[PDB]
Every structure is written in structure tokens, then in C-alpha cells.
Design a protein around this nucleic acid. Structure first.
Lengths: 81, 89, 122, 80
RNA sequence: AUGGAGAGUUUGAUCCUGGCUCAGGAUGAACGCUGGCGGCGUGCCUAAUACAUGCAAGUCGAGCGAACGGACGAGAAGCUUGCUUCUCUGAUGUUAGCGGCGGACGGGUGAGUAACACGUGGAUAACCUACCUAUAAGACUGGGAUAACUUCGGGAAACCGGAGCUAAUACCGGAUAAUAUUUUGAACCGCAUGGUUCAAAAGUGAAAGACGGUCUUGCUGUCACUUAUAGAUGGAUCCGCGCUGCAUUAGCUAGUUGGUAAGGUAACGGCUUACCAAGGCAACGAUGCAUAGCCGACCUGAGAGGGUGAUCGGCCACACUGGAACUGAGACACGGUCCAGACUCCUACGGGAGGCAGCAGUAGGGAAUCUUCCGCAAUGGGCGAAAGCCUGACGGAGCAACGCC
RNA sequence: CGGUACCUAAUCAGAAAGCCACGGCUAACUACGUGCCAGCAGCCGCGGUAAUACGUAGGUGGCAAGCGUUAUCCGGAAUUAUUGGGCGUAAAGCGCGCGUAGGCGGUUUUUUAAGUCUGAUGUGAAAGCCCACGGCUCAACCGUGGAGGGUCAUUGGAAACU
RNA sequence: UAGGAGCUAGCCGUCGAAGGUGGGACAAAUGAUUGGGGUGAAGUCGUAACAAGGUAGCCGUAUCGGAAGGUGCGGCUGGAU
RNA sequence: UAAGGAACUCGGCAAAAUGACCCCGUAACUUCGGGAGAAGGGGUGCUCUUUAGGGUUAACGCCCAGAAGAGCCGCAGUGAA
């Protein structure tokens, strides 16, 4: 017996999870290569890091990621750089 | 949000209300934070409001909201009138 | 081709897990059976509980032989095991939870209740 | 605030920076009222394998540093 | 200190040991006989067994597109000179959608769990916290999209699967500020460590609606907005003790116990994965099996102590059974999703659906436990400027000598 | 809720009692029937021709909108005894040694404060139990103020006894 | 043209509930028949104990007997001089 | 040799199936030796790295690899017997 509010919440949670995993995989990709670019002393060791630290609190002022995993990721980049 | 409420005690066809600052998600007759005073509509003539006004202002200054009947209780004594002078100063 | 003393998986929750055929009913001298043919059979491995128990003699219809049937358009269908549904002597089953695919060729044998209680029919 | 300040007696210094003290006190019995000694092996965190077996060690509790040790060392009153 | 009694029974007759049986209280009691009422309470203890039907979570037009209804300026007039044909200012009303918030509370149940579940007392220099309150600083400039709607196909259906349009406090891009983070200094502690100025580099927001007055304006009040601090709240983890019966259960562990790294968690950590080391617990009862939610409390007792967990509160656990993640401040979610399973239902047989341990009710079990009622008027809760709507929470009515007076 | 609570009038002794016991514990008994039969029974035990114990009838008594039976729990039960029991013969001393763990341990002085005692807090929510008032027409019940948290933890002290 | 950055769908293998087997452990129900016990009424047969109970009884053990019991060895007085 | 799988038959007669090696596990019952290769499972090709034993020895080499990763190929790796 579906109440007529929960049939609308299952709709708007599919619409809102597609926007999340697009953004949340982009934050995990942009730190997968910037942590590689901290190694090897490459060219964009101060440009991809500025992109990675950017996206990991675009997703922290929104509630994708928590504001203590944001500070934990951006400390694992900027200490090693 | 914490809000000053009325938790009813007493028997059938004889309501007795104690006034209570409590969280909005607790049940009515359930767990409380602090019990300010009482309220009794079915007495002889008065409502018999007892409020320790030194303590009711400790909650109104950090987020307690009266809900439409204790806001009449506090105004019947005069706590809500005296509440402005903390905000005015 | 299903003859006497063939073990068949039982394809519902009638209480049986394995069953062996006594006779292929039909006519006299009838040797084999395919999809849509009713066989009389004793259960050998039975589920604890249910309806039928080990040593009951039940009637049951063939669904999904391993040597399947030919259709009028020259099409064929074959399955990886021989299965079986125990019925209740009005061409209606014992269970309500028929398992596995059922061949189409028993729609025309008035086993419509077995079709409706089944997965995708092919 | 402040944390608990127990004193004990080491039992087995195994390898890798861990000793286990033995705080012994006297619970009384419920019905008959007789005092009875009982033991409690409290795992604790040695810094650099300092304390040896036989020592009496003052300890203090801390945050969980492993699965079973919750306490730290502060001071050694006597040793062997 | 208002606090303690007994009797019968072994014998032909005694004394003693010793069990047995009564006199006293209570109950979620049942049954038999009998039966004017009234007031407060209480009423599936069994099968955490399966459930027909209504019905318990919705709300906001002052977030905004659409729609629909219709007054009101409403022509020429079919002349039936008032019927509106349509046209319209469209006042204003209603909703199917998008969106915000609430669905994690309230309500039920005690299956599982002998356990940091609970009780009590602590700890967090290892923690998170939407709304609410307070303090400041802000709210700039652009963009594309998609339901609704129109059209198509499948299906008797209900809903899928396509095609083209549209709006926002939806979504997204760019500016502008932090006490976050990473580098360098000066205090104090309880080991890692903190707090409070400093000073350098990178990083990050946004919303408009309905008013007011007056300038064809530009400031503006109400409450949404997001940024940083606090407070209040709710939550989490850790610890000392207190936790049933068996030894006719005596060896349990192998990520098990440490280490060093790395990930990841709100957070510490064998929490997980690599290597290194062989530890760890246990007659003070490891383990195993069996039983049981725990406590306030209630019943009993002169106390010591014994017994119970109905009702009423606190906490935990569960939501047909077993796993999992999403959304969100908060769930790994009772009238949410996904998967697996066992049952059950509709069917035009093409594929669709449901989970009363919510409130009454039914069948079944049973010695046994009720109306498919009324109301949001009170108190409380949600959403709203608000009126207000929704609230089987709750307030009442009904039945039963079930108890008390 | 509800034209309910309640208050005014009108009428009538109208319609509104059963239930279990009667030997002795245990306050309440005589008579007919029946004659180890039918049956009672919590215990001991009643019935075979004069039954106060069966069955009925008249009495009486317990107390009453209830009464009685059954089930379960605590008490009586000092029949798990710390308070508060025992082991020659009633049930109960291992058939006796050597000894591990544990329990317990002579006298004095100094000393510490774990046990112990004492006083400063804090806390053991609300409801109820006890006590005192208030509101129910009384009482049940309801409300408010108090013993009070006495279990524990934090803090000073005391130093005999372990 | 569009492409790169991405992203989604799919695909690949580690962990994974249920299921599949397999041998044991544990627990419960049932089972033709069976052997002790309890209780009853006694069908029936004895006389073992209690009186030095007909041979003092009893305890351990062996043996014999359908059983009660009998005997050997040792012990006891809770027995007779 | 489809499909079935002892329905054959006096009877699984015959045939089939099992088999090597390595690893893991192996019950009732016992005269304690056994049962026991009980049963029941798993693995096996080739190529390249890692070191790695036995020592062959001036040693890695000679010789079995002591083992672990990585890769390749087939329907199948004691690929025949």
C-alpha cells in the first residue's frame, strides 16, 4: 500500500543520485591523477592539485562528501606536494 | 528544535498540565528536558499558572519556542513582555 | 523420450524434489512421453513438509524434456533437464510456485493453470 | 577533566610495545559480606619497550589505541 | 526503631528429627452459580501465525510553470433585445505535475541478543548535529536542461518505451571572504597533543517571492537564502563496576594478539588489506549449549531476601525471512527502493501487485481478552505569513463485575 | 463528548440477592432419605439401619453484587539458616596420607591509607511507595510540597583494627 | 566534420546472502518388540529378616540358585557367653 | 551411439565407470595393531620473472627445482598408453 508521497520520493531519489555519482566520480578521478601528478615531479604538479582541491569542496559545500573527508583528502595531496 | 510545551497529567475529564521545555521529537507524556511549572484550567476560578520566570528566560534566549498556549501562559504572567528588555538592551 | 523408471526433477513446491515414472498413461503399450503427457510416478526425494511425501504415487505432467518437441513451423525446443509438475487429477496442479521454463506445447492440453503459475513460457 | 589513574603489576611483556598490568582490588560479596580479591588484566601501551616483567606500573586511560588496549603508561613506581 | 504470633499429621502412649497439608495476601486470571447502578483504571499472557476490506503522512499558489472553472470591461446581434456564438480585462477558485520540507518523529512488538544490550558512575587533547536562537559578513554575473503538455508504439487494462516544446527558491558555469587545510614563530599538559594571535601560497557560496511608500525610481519591512562562529539540542564511540542455569561444557581462538605502513570513518581502532612478530583469553569459569530484551517499578516479606516485567516512563532491538545500497543533517528506513527466498493475489495469460508485531476487524490457536464507532474541540506533531488542512498520536463514545472504591 | 455531568419539580415501598461452608482445625445442627451403595475429601479421614462429614429440607453463619473452585507467585518454611540450621546413633565426616592454587595466620615499634570510619559536594529523571496539604459531594483517584536518594563517583581528614 | 576533458551504459575479476552437494557432530520426535521399577487387587508359591526368628545378623567380594537366599574369605557389634 | 539408465536378468553376467602423482580430509567398530588408498574433495599444460632448496661444486651454474607471482592456449593439460 504505497502512500502517494513515497512514490514521488523514489522518483526524485533516482533524479538526485544521477547528479551525485556524476559529480562524485569526477572528484575521485581528479584526485586519482593529481595524486599521481604529485609523484613523478610532472608539469602540472601545481595545476592539477589546484583542480583536485577545487572539486573536493565543490562536493563538500554540497552534501556529496563530508567536510572532514574533504579536509582529509586535501591534506593527503598538499602535504605530499 | 526545543520548544516549551504542555504535557498533560491528571485523570479523565480532569486535565492537569505541567509546562515543559522539551524537544519537539519526543512524545507528549515522554522524556523531558526541564519542567518549568504547571497549568490547571479546571480549578475554581483561576488557571493557577506557576512559573519560575528566572528559569523560563534561560530557555527563551537560546531557542525555545512557545507554542500558542504557553505563549498565552507566559503572557498571562508577563514573561513575554519582560523578554523584550533582553533583546532591547 | 520419458519411459518407465526415469528420474525427473519436480518443477514446483508440491513437496517433491525427485520422482520416477511408473507408467506413461494414455494407451496400451505406450512407451515414451513428451511435453503435455501425464505420467503416474512415485516421489523419491521429497521435501520435509509440503503435501506429498516419499513413497506416494502421484500423477504428474511432463514439462521440459531434454529431448524436446518439434513445432508445426519446423521449430524445435530443447532443455537441459527433465522436469515435472505434480497435478491434482483435474489437470490442475498441487503447488502455486511452479519453477523453471515451461514449453508452450501444453497450453493446448488444458494446463492453463500450470502456465499462469510459471515463469516465461518458451 | 581528568582520566582514571590506576596502578598495577605487569604480567607478560610480549613483543612490540605492549605490556599488560594486573590491577587487583577487593570486591565484597553480595550476600555474605566477605571480601575477595579479583584480578583484571588491563592491556596498556608502552612507548619503546621500557617496562620489564616484575615491575609495578602506574597507568592512565586514553583513547583506543588498538583492539584490546585502551590505556597508556605514565610512571613506574618500582621495578625488578 | 509502629516491627515477627499458628494448626493438623508417623505411635498403644511420649519426646525428637522430618517432610506433607491448611489458615494470610495478591493476579492482564479463567471457570461455575448469580447479577440495579455510579466513578476511575484495565482488557490476545497463546500463533514474532496467515490476513478480506477502510484508515493510520501529508502539506505549501506568498517556490512556477501549466491547466480547468468562472465572474467582470464584455461589441456588432441569431432580434429569441437578452441568449453571452466567439472575443476578451481575466478578479478569483480548484487541483494532476516540477520543487521545498516532513516521511528516521509519533504508533506497535519483544523474535533475536548473556552482550558495554542495559543500570550506575565516568571519559572524548579521537566525535557529528537539519530545523531553533544569537552574532557578524554577504546575496554578483551568465547558461543550458527536464516532467507537465503535444505526438507515437506495446498493453482490454495499470504503466512502460519513443519524438518535439516550457518554468522556477530545480540544476549548472564564472567572480568575490573565511578561524578549514600546509608551510614557519612565540604559552601549557595528562602520551599522541591545545589555545591565540600571527604570515605566506592555493581553494569555496547565492533566491527569489509576496508588501510598503514615493521619483518612469532606489532605498526598503516580513522569511525564506549560504558563509563563519557560538549556545541549545539530538546522536555516536570508549571505560570502571553490576548482569541466568549447567564443569554429566576444560581448551578456546588464526585478522585471532601486537607491530609498521597504507587506505577509510563523523570519529579512534585487527574497522579492513598488505608484510613482520607469536602472541591473546581462561577454575576470579575462556568456550560451548540452553534460557531470557534490561531498568525505573510492581507484588510479597519484620527485615535480610524472594518473585514479576501487563499497564505507565527511560533505553535497546526488530518490521514476511536473509543480504545490500541510495536520498538525506539524521536510515542502511514499519504504511521507500534493489536483489535473493518462502507464501499470496489480479489477469483479456500480454505481465502486474502485496507484507496489520498502526487502529478497529476476520480466520486459526486457546481456559481466556472487546466496536470494522465519534472528533481534531483540548494537548502534542508535520507543512504553511496566515486562515487552515492532515493527524486510528491523542481526546471521547461503545462492550466485558476484570479489578478497585 | 453532549442535551452528557448536574440541579429543580411529579409519581410508587413499586423492580433491584444471591453464593459457599455446618466432624476438628474453622466462629454456624437438628431431622428425614440412603445403608461400604450413591457418593464426599485441603488434612486426619466419613458411608455396612440410631451419618451433626453423603443427598435433600428447616435453621444458623461467614460477607455481599458478588460468592466459590482451579492455576501461578511470595509468606507461614529457621524445609538452603549471612542475620538464622546441621553431620556419635534420625539424612550428613572423603578409607587415610603428601601437597598445588586459594582461605586464614604469634608479639612489639615506625610507617602508608587499599579495606575501614568521618564530612564536603555532585548525582541515582518524571511517575509511584512513605509523610503533609489541595481538588474530586466522601472514598477510589488526581495534583502539589517533603523523607531523598542510603547503593555510586569526586574531595578533605582520622590511624586503632585487617 | 567535430574533437579532447570528462561522464554514463556495458564489459573484466576480488569480496559477497541464499542455494547446491559431502562427511561427521549435536538436539528432538517416533518405532515392532523389549527389563527393571512404581502402584493396585491378589492368581499362586515359599519363609529370608524381626525373639540366640529356627544356622547370630549385617558390610565388601567371589560363586551357586527360578528367586528368597546358601557357602568360602575378611571385617563389624548396630549380637549371645 | 539420441533419449532413458538395470526397466535386462536366475543374478549388473558382460561391458561401462575407478585408477598416476600431489594436497586436504578420512566414520562406525576394534583383539589397539587396525579399519584406511575408508569415504570425501582439490590440483596437474606451457611461458616469463622472484628466490630457491638439495648440494653439483670455484657456486648461481651440474642437477631435481624449494616455492611464489605474472602471462599464454585449447573442448579437454598424469591431453597417448
Amino acid at each position: 500500500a504505497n502512500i502517494k508521497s513515497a512514490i514521488k520520493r523514489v522518483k526524485t531519489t533516482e533524479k538526485a543520485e544521477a547528479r551525485n555519482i556524476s559529480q562524485k566520480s569526477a572528484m575521485r578521478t581528479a584526485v586519482k591523477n593529481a595524486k599521481t601528478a604529485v609523484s613523478n615531479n610532472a608539469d602540472n604538479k601545481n595545476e592539477l592539485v589546484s583542480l583536485a582541491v577545487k572539486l573536493v569542496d565543490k562536493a563538500a559545500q554540497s552534501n556529496l562528501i563530508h567536510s572532514n573527508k574533504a579536509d582529509r583528502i586535501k591534506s593527503q595531496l598538499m602535504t605530499a606536494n | 528544535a526545543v520548544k516549551i510545551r504542555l504535557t498533560r497529567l491528571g485523570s479523565k475529564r480532569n486535565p492537569f498540565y505541567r509546562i515543559v521545555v522539551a524537544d519537539a521529537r519526543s512524545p507528549r507524556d515522554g522524556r523531558i528536558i526541564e519542567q518549568i511549572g504547571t497549568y490547571n484550567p479546571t480549578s475554581a476560578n483561576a488557571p493557577e499558572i506557576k512559573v519560575d520566570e528566572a528559569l523560563a528566560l534561560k530557555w527563551l534566549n537560546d531557542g525555545a519556542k512557545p507554542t500558542d498556549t504557553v505563549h498565552n501562559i507566559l503572557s498571562k504572567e508577563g514573561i513575554m513582555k519582560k523578554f523584550d528588555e533582553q533583546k532591547k538592551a | 523420450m520419458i519411459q518407465q523408471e526415469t528420474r525427473l526433477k519436480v518443477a514446483d513446491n508440491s513437496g517433491a524434489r525427485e520422482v520416477l515414472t511408473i507408467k506413461v498413461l494414455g494407451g496400451s503399450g505406450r512407451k515414451t512421453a513428451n511435453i503435455g503427457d501425464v505420467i503416474v510416478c512415485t516421489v523419491k526425494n521429497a521435501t520435509p513438509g509440503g503435501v506429498v511425501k516419499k513413497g506416494d504415487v502421484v500423477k504428474a505432467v511432463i514439462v521440459r524434456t531434454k529431448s524436446g518437441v518439434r513445432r508445426n513451423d519446423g521449430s524445435y525446443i530443447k532443455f537441459d533437464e527433465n522436469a515435472c509438475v505434480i497435478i491434482r487429477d483435474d489437470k490442475g496442479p498441487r503447488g502455486t510456485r511452479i519453477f523453471g521454463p515451461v514449453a508452450r506445447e501444453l497450453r493446448e492440453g488444458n494446463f492453463m493453470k500450470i502456465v499462469s503459475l510459471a515463469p516465461e513460457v518458451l | 577533566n581528568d582520566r582514571k589513574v590506576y596502578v598495577g603489576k605487569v604480567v607478560s611483556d610480549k613483543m612490540d610495545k605492549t605490556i599488560t598490568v594486573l590491577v587487583e582490588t577487593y570486591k565484597t560479596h553480595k550476600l555474605y559480606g566477605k571480601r575477595v580479591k579479583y584480578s583484571k588484566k588491563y592491556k596498556t601501551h608502552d612507548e619503546n619497550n621500557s617496562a620489564k616483567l616484575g615491575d609495578i606500573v602506574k597507568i592512565q586511560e586514553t583513547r583506543p589505541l588498538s583492539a584490546t588496549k585502551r590505556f597508556r603508561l605514565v610512571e613506574i613506581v618500582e621495578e625488578s
